[PDB]
Known about the structure:
Chain C is mostly helical.
Amino acid sequence: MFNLFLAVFPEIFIINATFILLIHGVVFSTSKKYDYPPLASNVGWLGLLSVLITLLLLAAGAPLLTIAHLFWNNLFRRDNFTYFCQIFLLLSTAGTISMCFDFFDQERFDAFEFIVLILLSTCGMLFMISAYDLIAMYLAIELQSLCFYVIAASKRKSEFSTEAGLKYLILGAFSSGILLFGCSMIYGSTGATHFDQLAKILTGYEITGARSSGIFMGILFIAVGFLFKITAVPFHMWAPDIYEGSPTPVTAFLSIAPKISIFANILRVFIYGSYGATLQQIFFFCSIASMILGALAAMAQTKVKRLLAYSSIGHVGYICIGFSCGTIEGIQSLLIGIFIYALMTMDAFAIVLALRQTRVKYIADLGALAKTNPILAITFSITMFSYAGIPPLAGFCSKFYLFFAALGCGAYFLALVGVVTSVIGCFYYIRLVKRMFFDTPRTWILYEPMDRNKSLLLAMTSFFITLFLLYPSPLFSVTHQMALSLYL
Amino acid sequence: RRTILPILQAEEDERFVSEWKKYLEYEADVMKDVPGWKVGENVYNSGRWMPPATGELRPDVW
Amino acid sequence: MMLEFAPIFIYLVISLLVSLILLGVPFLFRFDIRFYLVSILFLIFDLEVTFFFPWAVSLNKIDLFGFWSMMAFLFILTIGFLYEWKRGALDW
Amino acid sequence: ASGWGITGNKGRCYDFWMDFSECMSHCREPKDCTLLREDYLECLHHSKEFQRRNRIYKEEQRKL
Amino acid sequence: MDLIKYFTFSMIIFILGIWGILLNRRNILIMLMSIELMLLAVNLNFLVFSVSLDDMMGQVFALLVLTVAAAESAIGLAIFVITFRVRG
Amino acid sequence: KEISKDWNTVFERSINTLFLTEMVRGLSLTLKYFFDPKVTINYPFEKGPLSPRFRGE
Amino acid sequence: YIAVPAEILGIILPLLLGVAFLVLAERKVMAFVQRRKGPDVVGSFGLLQPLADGLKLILKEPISPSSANFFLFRMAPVATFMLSLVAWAVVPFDYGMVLSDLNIGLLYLFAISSLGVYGIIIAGRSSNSKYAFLGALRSAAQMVSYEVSIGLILITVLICVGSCNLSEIVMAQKQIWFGIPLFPVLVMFFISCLAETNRAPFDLPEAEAELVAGYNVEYSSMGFALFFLGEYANMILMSGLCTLFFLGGWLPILDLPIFKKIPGSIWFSIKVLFFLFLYIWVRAAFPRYRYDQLMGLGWKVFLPLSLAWVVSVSGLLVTFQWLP
Amino acid sequence: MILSVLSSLALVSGLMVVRAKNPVHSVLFFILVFCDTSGLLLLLGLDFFAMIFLVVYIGAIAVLFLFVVMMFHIPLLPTQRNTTSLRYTVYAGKVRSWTNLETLGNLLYTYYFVWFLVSSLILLVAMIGAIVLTMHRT
Amino acid sequence: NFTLNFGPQHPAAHGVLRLVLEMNGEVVERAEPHIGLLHRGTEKLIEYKTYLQALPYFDRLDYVSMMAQEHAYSLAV
Amino acid sequence: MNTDITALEKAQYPVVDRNPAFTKVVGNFSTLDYLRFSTITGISVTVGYLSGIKPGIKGPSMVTGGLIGLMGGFMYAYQNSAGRLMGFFPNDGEVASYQK
Amino acid sequence: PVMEKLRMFVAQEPVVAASCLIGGVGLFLPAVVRPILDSL
Amino acid sequence: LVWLEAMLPLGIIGGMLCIMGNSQYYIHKAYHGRPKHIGHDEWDVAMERRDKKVVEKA
Ligand SMILES: CCCCCCCCCCCCCCCCCC(=O)O[C@@H](COC(=O)CCCCCCCCCCCCCCC)COP(=O)(O)OCC[N+](C)(C)C
Ligand SMILES: CCCCCCCCCCCCCCCCCCCC(=O)O[C@H](COC(=O)CCCCCCCCCCCCCC)COP(=O)(O)OCCN
């Protein structure tokens, strides 16, 4: 009876710790004895400890978590792919929550509900990766969606935060409605909400032999909703505004934690529920458009957060290249690109949060940064080059293997567009470089020193980026095992 | 109620077979041209029989 | 089994007619947040009632499992309501 | 497909789906018993029966 | 033929909600009603499909969708009243 | 610091404030007067008492 | 199938005259509690007083400019009155003395009660006043708040019987009423029905709405009276709900097979009028309750306690396998 | 014919929702859309959902919207000559026939109980979010 | 903030009471009563009448404690 | 309810009590399980104390961290003990204990 | 000890303490009494 | 004794409450010939339909 729950401890524990943190915060934030203490950093440290403990629980249950798989079959199906995806998403969440501690006390934002909502959205993401049915898929999407709608509008003094939160709300609600309408007809035309039986009724007959106007258009609507979820061009109506308006730690959690889970979800849907080979076309054109428009639009931006938003869109296109070529190498390149992009995004947002102590807004404020803090300047330049794809760094390997996967399937146009978009993409990255090493403005902005957690995370990520090409075997082997575990 | 239905099911079967042979002789009557019509056959390739479908979803509530 | 709603429809039509004939006799002669908060709490604690309704009726069929799942649901909403209570937003 | 009926007895198409799934459980090529898949699909919607009745009504109509 | 009528009615409600949310970029109130209309249309799709197939996975998920609809409406009006506090 | 912290008396007070003992005691008083004879007088037939010193017409 | 309208009229007209005589009973009982007589001159014992009141209200000029869109103000009384009547289409008086036989008929009652909030809201909004609308909104918030306690108590009742059908609920009370074990739950349900109709010490929202304004709004002569009629019909309905659920709906109270001459149709009516008498007693025995503490009470002493009662009933029934 | 007029009136109300002149009338037509939808579900044979639509949509969501608005201002061909008499009724299964409520509760809290707890977590997210944003308490 | 006014006619406010008060929406911030609605003019009338003719004015001042004011006037005399 | 605890990937190691009761696996805690439980609880308590000095809540933070650490360490120890009995873990001790 | 604080809490909040007591009874009956009567 | 005057309006409203039910009961019995069943399930409506058909045939 109780031992049938050995496969859900990494989630039951995080829920219980979330409840304990919420209770402790609400009890001791209104105590007159301590005079309404600012227990946001306390709740944040306890939440980081809880995330570490549930990561330890998840890591040591590799032989476990596959028991009572018949009992849990209707609800979720977790396997080697799900195990690694969860163990990486939880690490990303831990890093994000760790690098935002100074944000709580530097600008006096002691709202512990931020941390509990991070934790609960992370629980929703952990549900999403294990989700193996349309209903659980949609519910796990909605958990993180509502958590982020609440969190984005948390800072209720700036017109950017509120308007960005409202735009995110409306766009996410429309995307969720589109996706749910898509799932409704796939249920209607076949029954069989479960993924296991959805991958068996559609494999029997190809879409070319006979045309089913329900399943095809439901699959199309599901794909459209998912592309809205990851903000893939042309479904990028407000994403730069969302990333600019939202608070910096929120945007740090976004574009890493949500995208990983949504991409795992899209992998599960694409591999099983798609046998008509009609999602190759929708991913093809949309990824090409994302590549081109991200490369051509990030060069015209003068702020920092908008540039990171458009770089995220471009990297989403680069990763989506892997969906068009459906092979083991394509999925391997996709997952490796996701991993490298997650590390580089964490490093870049650590940079942005570091200069947030003095309210950095534009790209010209970080002028002559090689004089005040040379080592931070070097770190930022290295991270920017890693974004660019320069060979002697991580990020070049991901683009390399994505191009290899694209050429493996004979999508020769994908390789050419990838090359040209990379060529333009590196240009404005180097443009960012010039204003930060070479030309010195008349007025210099002075940045106060950083704290230990952000510095440690930044140093670890910087040494990972530079020295990745020396020893990349473990990542490649993890990714090859994960790609094959979708079937066996 | 479980010791009463075999006779009610029996009379329902009688009525249904009466209506079914009437409809079969009606269908064989209209279709004498266009050779290739096998009159009444099981559309189920497995051979299992189910009641004739009607385009009225949930009819047993009104 | 569901023909018993047409009487409701006819009753509603006749009640509307009676209301009309009752109203026609003489003829023939700024913002508060607390309101939003109480509405939200009502919505949240009305969804739980809509969830309770299938649980109570079918509680016989399900022993020691549905009961404990509903108890976990109640515990989650009780944690929510406890956070509601201490934070304020519940008194005027 | 799931097997939980509305009235509380069983899905009217559950037996056909289970027969199809059992055939596919030991058939590495889907073409061998695509007949069962067709039976399950047209058990959901009754497409073929409705087409036949449409043909009957067309034979009625052409007599004009 | 009633399944066709049901599906067409729900689809027209869906496209009408899309129409409502697309036109007025500023109302911010009609958008929420249009989103609710979209959710309503999808709920009717699920329930009608569940009745037609005599399968129960349609009504369970339709009932669960109401929680999402209510939560989205609550958060939407919270953000709306926060936004309105700035102006006027 | 007004305190009533005793194991026995906390139970006694927490019951009176929970079973509406004061409300019931104030409610049963009106029912006593419900069955009691009334004090009114039908004016046109019975007049209220006066005094020889009354000041009228 | 043409027999329905006769039943509809037979349910409607006695309800209206019962509302009139319930107003008369209110006046008379409050008079007797305060050592008075109340309306006695008209009729024999005041029995013709409501008729005189009605004929007086009709024979007056109607103040109906409505100072507004002319539509929303005339539809609010219609909506509240039709709702307070349609809530009566499911009550199982004795055995076949029920108009509609809904297989749920309880979640239906909850829905109908919850829908009876828009009437007062649009009445307040349509009535162009800066305080009447606000008072109507506070009253709506009060009813909305006590709806959840009503629903939890309904769930408590529904757990024991096991089916939503109202007739089966009374059928399940052959052994005991459900009022003997659930007496705290019965008190809670009475207080919630008392506070959800603004007919209680839980009254202040509307009481101050007239004190500070005097109803200097578009006050129709007897078009406004439909609110009063609907409120008293709701009084009667929520008086009968308590004797449907917690008391025996029509079963004899404490009876040996001797007093079988009387039918079950009056066993219901006697309990209904007893609960109405309790309503009047509570009104004329307690002082009014402030809205500041009204909301706090309704949210902090009834929701947690009713939830605890739900939990305890469910746990006790499950433990000993006493479910339906 | 009951379905056609009800669907048409619902469609008209939904159309007037998005092209309304003032938010009050928009919400008023928004209520009528769900009223007609619940009637349509009632015709479909699902009484439970038809009344949950009153309890939730026009019971709490419509009230919430109104509160916010107040302040801050292949088909089978119709030929049926020989089909109304070809209805085969299987009497087995009519004995001990569950309703729309017993069947739903049989498997909502027992087999698919994870999704139920996910919906609970969604409700908790909504409850927390409505408080963090809007507590001015000045 | 709005400034609504009292003056209810039922005897709740003991009648003849006019109260113009400013509230903060729900909480009153300042109440300014407007007395003078019952200024008969007794003080001016007493001067025109004998010490005995002026006694019944004192019954009409505080008309729930009629013999209390007569007591004060008699003691003064 | 119908419960079947059968792992997709079978245990590579000998299995004892394929469905172990809660009390027995709690009673199967070895010295390593107690050590890891203790170190997890101690780390959690230390983090709770250290973090909650700036807000001033030094004791309540300790208690919260202690509760979190107790729950996490107990879950980890139970998982290890179960996987040992289920056979997923090296379990060289109670396989010998089973024989005698 | 905890008894003083618990009793002071019960004195100040009667409804919350009563609700907790009844809920604890209703949760203790099926979690403790039920297994011991299951085994007769 | 003296308090019966207050109970007369209660008696009137109770009597009209009981005739409320009795009216619809007598109307339904008059034309249908039977009182209304407490539980109408699909099985009960199925036998009602079949009984109507067999009575019509006979
Ligand atoms: C049991 C099920 C779960 C129950 C909890 C679930 C809900 C979560 C609630 C978590 C928050 C609860 C936090 C409050 C608990 C009581 C707080 C407390 O005990 O601290 C007391 C007293 O506590 C202590 O003194 C010692 C307590 C800590 C020592 C024990 C550490 C915990 C060890 C392991 C945890 C227990 C074992 C695991 C559970 C069995 C107050 O001391 P101070 O006021 O800080 O001291 C004076 C401060 N000043 C100088 C400024 C005036
Ligand atoms: C014979 C047939 C009669 C049928 C009618 C039923 C009787 C109706 C009698 C009604 C008479 C009184 C009506 C007055 C109406 C207004 C009174 C409300 C006052 C009120 O709400 O007080 C609250 C307590 O009420 C409550 O708590 C009430 C709920 C009762 C709780 C249960 C009490 C015992 C529980 C024991 C359970 C035993 C079973 C365990 C297995 C808390 O008042 P406060 O404000 O001072 O509190 C401080 C917190 N801010």
